Amino acid sequence: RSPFIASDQHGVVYITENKNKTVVIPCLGSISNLNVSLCARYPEKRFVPDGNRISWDSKKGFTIPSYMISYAGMVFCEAKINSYQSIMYIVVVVGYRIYDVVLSPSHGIELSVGEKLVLNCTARTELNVGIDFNWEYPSSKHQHKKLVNRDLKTQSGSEMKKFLSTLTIDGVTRSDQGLYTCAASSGLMTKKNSTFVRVHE
């Protein structure tokens, strides 16, 4: 039916951090002698090969410096003989950096049996980042545990995102005494931080 041949009816494109700064849309063509452009939206923008930098190879698909399509919700290559087009590829801009993981309180947690423990883990990251938290604590034997994950607003407008995970134990016991390690995970990158919670009479 179509010159373009690429699994699903829609594909995915990820703008990870440069270089190359160039992203590849796999618009693999059935023919070689085709004048292909890259259509991005919204708003509508058309991008035309300027060898060498922007280019379409019939074996590699379209290649564009990713800053030009980062704004976009979705892209697709368009070839015309007299107008065919590829499948829609969703643009996902993906951050990965975590600046710092900080616990609160940071140091010297002294508690007595029955007291409330409240750990605040906070991860600060670059933009286009989401985080999954994974905690590690002495009593993986479940006893009155509670975990709440929140979005705090950096803005400010700074250039960052700030995330909060909050551990809670209502009646600490001596089994719960030990190392508490909160892990923050963004894309692939992962940063850990820990404090010692001491429990005695």
Binding site: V12, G73, I90, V92, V94, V129, G130, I131, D132, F133, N149, R150, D151, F163, S165, S185, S186, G187, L188
Partner: protein, 103 residues
């Protein structure tokens, strides 16, 4: 007289600013208030919410009837192990508004 020029514009101003349903963008992950590790593509949905101004403080613009709408969005989660998954979410759509008393 020139007074008609001022009157024309001012009546028109009241009309355009009244309490009525208005097309707005809604940040999805904020209404649903999802998560630290959850992204939506698209980030928003076009839906009608009540806006405008009431002439007497003590009346605020509120909807009097609401439809709901199921829109389909691709949900992305991190660490990305998938896979944008087609999920549906049900968004409120206001169909009538009125400046109703506050308390």
């Amino acid at each position: 007289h020139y007074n008609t020029e001022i009157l024309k514009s001012i009546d028109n101003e009241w009309r355009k600013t009244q309490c009525m349903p208005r097309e707005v963008a809604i940040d999805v992950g904020k209404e649903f208030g999802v998560a630290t590790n959850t992204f939506f593509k698209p980030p928003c949905v076009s839906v009608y919410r009540c806006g405008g101004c009431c002439n007497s403080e003590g009346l605020q613009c509120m909807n009097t009837s609401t439809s709901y709408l199921s829109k389909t969005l691709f949900e992305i989660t991190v660490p990305l192990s998938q896979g944008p998954k087609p999920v549906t979410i049900s968004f409120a759509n206001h169909t009538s508004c009125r400046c109703m008393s506050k308390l």
